[PDB]
Design a protein around this nucleic acid. Structure first.
Lengths: 114, 49, 134, 92, 22, 181, 44, 335, 50, 129, 58, 63
RNA sequence: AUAAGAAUUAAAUCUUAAAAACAAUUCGUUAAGCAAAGAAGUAGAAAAUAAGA
RNA sequence: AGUUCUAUUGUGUUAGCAUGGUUUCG
């Protein structure tokens, strides 16, 4: 089963932290028999509102990352719990990849008709 | 579950695409009953099932 | 040379008194209450006169201020001037109520206490007896 | 959310009226009154049924009154059913 | 009401007294 | 419909096979060229040992590492692969090229390729069956019987004359076991 | 005096726009030539 | 002898739109020679032109306001996704080139230019400049009245706005009519809407932040459900607000920013032809070869092929007018 | 802009692209084409000569 | 301009088709000829003020019911003494009064009226489309 | 072939919403089409609008 | 059948709605498209249905 | 006691009080338990439930 | 009608989350 995960790291997060988190996620995928498909960086984006992350602070933007992976359905709960426990991550969401409207295929001309 | 039902069909089918013959229907209904019984053992609070 | 060859009779060009949308018939008393609410919210200006209230306010302000009225009463003066200029040639409206106008269109539903009048016969009957023989 | 209005080259009374209109069309007072006190589920069922039955009638009668006012203002006459087979030809 | 508020007031008073003592 | 350029597309007898996209590695480029040459097959290929030197000379003219040399040598020394063999065999079967089908089937049956049985078994069986049927002389029923039994996972549907003469989890999983393609 | 018939209303829209532009240019040209004649008469 | 474009089309309003009436031919071609001969002969005949040819009629309201409303509705129905406008550049599609009514406009502009230069020759440069300024003022005044369906026409002719007959606010779904922008947003790109479409979700949310109902959004039930899910997920991901419309900086779709930049530059170079956008895309093509430039490259190839075809046609005409142009009528009709 | 609400440390890739573009297209050069896009090219193909 | 239901089914009108109208004319011509072949027979004509001023609004047939208790009474009850044929142009309006009238009735009406009020065929004896 | 239609009787019954303050469906959901219902074409005369998606796959 | 034939012809040729646009009887608003019997759309669909009755397919009659 | 807050038809119980850390109002920050406000026309298939007063 | 697959799921059970009335802390 294919899935896409979107993460929003804070400014305090570093490249080393991102690499560590991705390594942990790939370890979970391999444990659940899956395989990481792709990883991409969607740039720095301002939040629609200030994120008050308790015991971490207040943030006004974040760096957005995306990774797509095929894995057994049982891995999603573990991945979600791990991402929630991670400190730097501000927000995360994992969804089932769709045939047409997915970042792997429907990745260009999402706003420009011509 | 679909793979297991396909295997039972290939075992008990009249021809390659026969899925409605009463033998194949019996096999598929048995498989579905077993799957729902397992699902109920897990989600014992799912009353509609 | 080229141009329209038929009359420009489109009801958009020539708006007509009609309801362009139908609706399931409404209970007569419920419709009457809704129309009363609409009229109250609109505040149909059937008062003694639009200028009467402005004149009353102006006179009251003058009475309250007998010395510095020249400077005090200016908003009231401008309002009264506007009212005189706008509703000076004001005539009270003479039209049927929207309730009757919609009873004409048969919007409402006959209840126990409301029935549409039967078609007139005495007024509409026209008879012409002529010889027909030979 | 909270509506923000800028009182610039206008009357504070007019701006307050616009704010009141926003509140009325958003049902803010209705929700505040609802949450000020407990509403039992059956009462809510009855209220929602009543509203869903009532408001379309009000909208239709509002449209009818708008048409009546327009016709009175423009001195429009009652329509006659369009007779078919009329050539609709210009008298020119 | 008049139970939780009183209990929390007493709790805050005791906590402040203890912290000042410490 | 190439998303970006420059690119290298490969068509196998008027059929898209692979596309090398821009910004690829030297190893990937060499693998692409080798695969194209293998699928296509006076003419010769540089030795896998000298492939690294050839690539370095080409780069110098256009304008190595310890791991890069090994990667290039291994990639150039690799033989034909499962995708290439299966595509060639399928096209040959559709074209009824007896000698081709025969040679490709023999290469696929080669013992060294037995590691790819899970991917090549059905194609191998059907290639054998097609060769037996397309043989000029009328097909041998006894020979056909063995292949048909292998394909069908049983011999109860064959003519009689041609037919050759404990744990809980294990027992309940034996039900879903069928051995036909 | 006789104008063409088109298949779409776009054509009539643009035809009318062109007609208006041409008429404005005609007015300007007539005024310019009248001024030309007046200047010539004054000079002579 | 300054032409009309040299004289008056350098102004803002006058210079905004400048249609082309004749093909441009490089010096040294039969077309150029014939154009030179025609211009000389036309100038001489303008010198020997009579008064009756410059007669003009007073301007009047081309349409009533109600008729203008009807025409606007019909044009919108003709093109429900696009906005109605006098696409005088696309004119050739609707009006055959041989029956273009703008040849008169072109010749009148030439005549006006000739008249102004002769007036400058006769009376004096200062008077010529005065008259040129006055003509510029007149053109500016009459700029916005040419379009019968525009508001400039109504303002020029002093016509009161139409008071349309009341219509119901609550109508059946059969009659719901969205605007072209809402229509494009709802259709998306033939793909169901996802949370990643942050460039469009603002349409279906009110200023209050509440998601708009279906009667207001004019969306199908399935589309409404998809949009609701997309907005909920975006809000939970904190890329879409909770209590207001998204800020102008939040309108990028969830995608690669460089791919978004490539898309925007392609859109600019196609709609208007920004040479800066073309150069930026050219450099990006090599700097970031991992993005998608299919549409940009396809448009470039189309333009190059059209240029080559035009060059071949010009060579054929120079050798002698060939059957290509005749075919463009006869073969097209036969097909 | 506020230092605690803005984004810092990011690359000006767009500015770099503009600066590199200046090389292919001089900054003191035309901003548009003789025919401005699809519509202008359609007009060019659909206007006859003399 | 319209915000109402759009019907999908159209009903034909056999009673007012060409051949049926021709047969109506043929059958009514014989009765009219036979009636005129006899002397001292008058024909009443009834219509509506909006489809005819000059025509008198009162005649011998009219009864002019004035009491509530007389509402059910017909207004053309006595027309049989004077007239031998009632030519009606408003059968929908006069249906309740032409019902079981003791003189022949020749009605003129439209297919729409016939289909919307088919009961007028129980009060009309001869039909002229 | 001449074959009669099958019965319009279906197992389970008809949608029921649990009584009380839960809002849970005791059976089936609000989109359920009863067997004794007109055609989809009859119920949706207009059909897809011009701005609907031709392909409903997500 | 005109309900669908008119929709087809209008979708193919949207410009037919201009004709007699100011004449009462032609309702061209969205959701109606109901024209008079003398409108070009009505004549087109009438001819198409006549040919279909004569025994042609919808597309052949359209052509 | 008293005023203020709160509440009421009007009052009272109740809380704070003498320069304020939680009576009440404004502003931040977490914490706790809890969870249909916003998005679906019982309307339009001809589709219709019960002689009468 | 039933079985299989297909596209869609405001249906029922589900680990966790975003938001919010209320109370709470300063």
């Amino acid at each position: 089963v294919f899935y896409e995960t979107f993460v929003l790291f804070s400014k305090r997060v570093q490249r080393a932290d991102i690499r560590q988190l991705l390594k942990q996620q790939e370890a979970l995928i391999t444990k659940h028999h899956g395989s990481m498909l792709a990883v991409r960086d969607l740039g720095w984006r301002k939040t629609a509102f200030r994120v008050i992350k308790p015991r971490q602070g207040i943030f006004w933007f974040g760096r957005l990352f995306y990774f797509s992976f095929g894995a057994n359905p049982a891995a999603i709960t573990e991945m979600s719990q791990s991402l929630q426990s991670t400190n730097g991550v501000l927000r995360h969401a994992t969804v089932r990849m769709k045939k047409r409207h997915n970042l792997m295929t429907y990745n260009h001309h999402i706003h420009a008709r011509d | 579950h679909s793979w297991r039902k396909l295997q039972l069909c290939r075992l008990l089918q009249r021809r390659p695409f026969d899925t409605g013959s009463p033998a194949v229907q019996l096999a598929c209904l048995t498989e579905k009953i077993l799957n729902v019984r397992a699902h109920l053992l897990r989600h014992f609070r799912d009353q509609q099932k | 040379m080229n141009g329209c060859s038929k009359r420009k009779s489109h009801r958009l060009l020539k708006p007509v008194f009609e309801l362009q949308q139908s609706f399931p018939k409404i209970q007569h008393w419920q419709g009457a209450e809704i129309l009363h609410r609409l009229k109250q919210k609109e505040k149909d200006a059937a008062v003694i006169h639009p200028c009467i209230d402005t004149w009353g306010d102006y006179a009251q302000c003058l009475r309250r201020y007998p010395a510095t009225s020249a400077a005090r009463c200016r908003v009231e003066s401008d309002r009264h001037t506007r009212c005189l200029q706008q509703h000076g040639r004001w005539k009270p409206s003479d039209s049927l109520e929207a309730l009757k106008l919609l009873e004409m269109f048969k919007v409402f539903n006959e209840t126990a206490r409301f029935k549409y009048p039967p078609p007139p016969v005495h007024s509409l009957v026209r008879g012409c007896a002529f010889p027909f023989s030979d | 959310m909270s509506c923000h209005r800028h009182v610039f080259r206008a009357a504070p009374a007019a701006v307050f009226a616009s704010v009141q209109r926003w509140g009325r069309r958003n049902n803010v007072h209705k929700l505040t009154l609802l949450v000020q006190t407990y509403e039992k589920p059956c009462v809510k069922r009855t209220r929602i049924a009543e509203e869903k039955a009532y408001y379309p009638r009000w909208f239709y009668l509002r449209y009818a009154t708008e048409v009546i006012r327009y016709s009175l203002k423009h001195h429009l006459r009652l329509g006659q059913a369009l007779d078919p087979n009329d050539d609709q030809r210009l008298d020119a | 009401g008049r139970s939780k508020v009183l209990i929390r007031r007493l709790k805050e008073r005791a906590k402040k007294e203890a912290e000042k003592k410490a | 419909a190439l998303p970006s350029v420059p690119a290298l597309v490969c068509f196998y007898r008027k059929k898209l096979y692979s596309v090398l996209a821009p910004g690829a590695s030297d190893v990937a480029l060499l693998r692409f060229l080798k695969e194209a040459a293998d699928l296509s097959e006076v003419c010769s290929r540089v030795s896998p040992e000298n492939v690294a030197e050839a690539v370095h000379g080409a780069r110098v003219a256009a304008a190595l590492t310890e791991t890069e040399a090994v990667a290039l040598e291994g990639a150039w020394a690799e033989r034909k692969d499962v995708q290439c063999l299966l595509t060639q065999l399928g096209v040959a079967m559709t074209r009824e090229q007896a000698e081709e089908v025969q040679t490709l089937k023999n290469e696929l049956v080669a013992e060294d390729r037995s590691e790819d049985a899970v991917l090549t078994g059905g194609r191998r069986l059907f290639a054998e069956l097609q060769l037996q049927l397309t043989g000029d002389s009328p097909p041998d029923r006894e020979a056909l019987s063995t292949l048909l039994s292998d394909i069908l996972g049983s011999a109860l549907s064959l003519p009689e004359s041609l037919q050759p003469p404990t744990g809980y989890a294990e027992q309940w999983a034996s039900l879903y076991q069928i051995e036909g393609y | 005096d006789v104008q063409p018939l088109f298949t779409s209303g776009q054509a009539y829209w643009q035809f009318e726009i062109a007609k208006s532009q041409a008429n404005h240019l005609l007015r300007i040209r007539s005024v310019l030539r009248r001024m030309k004649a007046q200047a010539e008469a004054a000079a002579q | 002898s300054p032409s009309f474009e040299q004289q008056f089309l350098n102004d803002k309003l006058l210079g905004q739109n400048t249609l082309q009436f004749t093909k441009v031919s490089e010096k040294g071609t039969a077309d150029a020679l014939f154009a030179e001969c025609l211009e000389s002969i036309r100038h001489r005949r303008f010198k020997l032109d009579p008064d009756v040819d410059n007669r003009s009629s007073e301007a009047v309201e081309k349409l009533t306001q109600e008729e203008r409303a009807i025409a606007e509705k019909i044009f919108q129905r003709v093109d429900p996704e696009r906005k109605i406008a006098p696409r005088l550049e696309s004119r050739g599609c609707y009006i055959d080139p041989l029956w273009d009514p703008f040849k008169r406009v072109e010749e009148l502009q030439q005549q006006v230019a000739q008249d102004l230069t002769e007036y400058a020759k006769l009376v004096g440069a200062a008077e010529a400049r005065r008259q040129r300024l006055l003509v510029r003022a007149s053109l500016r005044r009459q700029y916005r009245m040419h379009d019968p369906l525009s508001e400039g026409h109504r303002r020029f002719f002093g016509a009161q706005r139409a008071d349309p007959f009341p219509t119901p606010h609550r109508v059946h779904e059969r009659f719901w009519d969205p605007s072209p922008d809402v229509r494009v947003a709802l259709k998306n790109n033939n793909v169901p809407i996802s949370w990643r479409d942050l460039h469009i979700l603002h349409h279906f949310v009110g200023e209050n932040g509440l998601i708009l109902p279906r009667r207001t959004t004019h969306a199908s039930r399935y589309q409404q459900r998809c949009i609701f899910k997309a907005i909920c997920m975006a809000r939970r991901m904190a890329l879409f607000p909770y209590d207001w419309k998204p800020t102008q900086g939040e309108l990028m779709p969830v995608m690669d920013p460089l791919q978004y930049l490539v898309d925007e530059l392609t859109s600019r170079y196609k709609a208007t032809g920004d040479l800066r956008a073309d150069a930026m895309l050219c450099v990006m093509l090599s700097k970031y070869p991992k993005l998608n430039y299919f549409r940009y490259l396809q448009y470039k190839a189309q333009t190059q092929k059209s240029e080559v075809e035009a060059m071949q046609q010009q060579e054929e005409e120079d050798r002698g007018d060939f059957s290509r142009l005749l075919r463009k009528y006869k073969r097209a009709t036969t097909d | 802009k506020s230092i605690k609400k803005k984004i810092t440390g990011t690359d000006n890739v767009f500015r770099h692209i503009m600066e590199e573009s200046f090389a292919v297209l001089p900054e003191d050069g035309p901003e548009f084409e003789e025919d401005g896009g699809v519509s202008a090219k359609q007009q060019k193909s659909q206007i006859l000569s003399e | 301009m319209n915000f109402n239901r759009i019907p999908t089914r159209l009903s034909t009108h056999y009673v007012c088709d060409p051949y049926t109208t021709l047969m109506h004319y043929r059958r009514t011509f014989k009765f009219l000829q036979a009636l005129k072949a006899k002397p001292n027979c008058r024909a009443l004509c009834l219509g509506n003020k909006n489809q005819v001023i000059s025509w008198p609004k009162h005649f011998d047939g009219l009864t002019v019911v004035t009491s509530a208790v007389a509402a059910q009474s017909s207004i053309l009850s006595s027309a049989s003494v004077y007239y031998s044929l009632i030519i009606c142009l408003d059968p929908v309006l006069f249906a309740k009064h032409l019902y079981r009238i003791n003189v022949p009735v020749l009605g003129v009406c439209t297919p729409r009226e016939i289909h919307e009020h088919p009961e007028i065929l129980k009060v009309i004896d001869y039909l002229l489309p | 072939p001449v074959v009669f239609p099958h019965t319009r009787a279906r197992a389970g019954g008809k949608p029921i919403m649990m009584r009380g303050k839960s809002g849970k469906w005791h059976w089936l959901g609000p989109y359920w089409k009863p067997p004794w219902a007109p055609s989809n074409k009859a119920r949706w005369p207009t059909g897809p609008e011009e701005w609907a998606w031709s392909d409903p796959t997500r | 059948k005109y309900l669908s034939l008119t929709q087809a012809v209008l979708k193919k040729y949207p410009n037919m709605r201009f004709q007699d646009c100011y004449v009462d009887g032609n309702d061209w608003s969205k959701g109606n498209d109901s024209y008079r019997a003398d409108h070009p759309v009505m004549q087109f669909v009438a001819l198409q249905l006549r040919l279909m009755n004569l025994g042609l397919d919808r597309h052949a009659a359209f052509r």
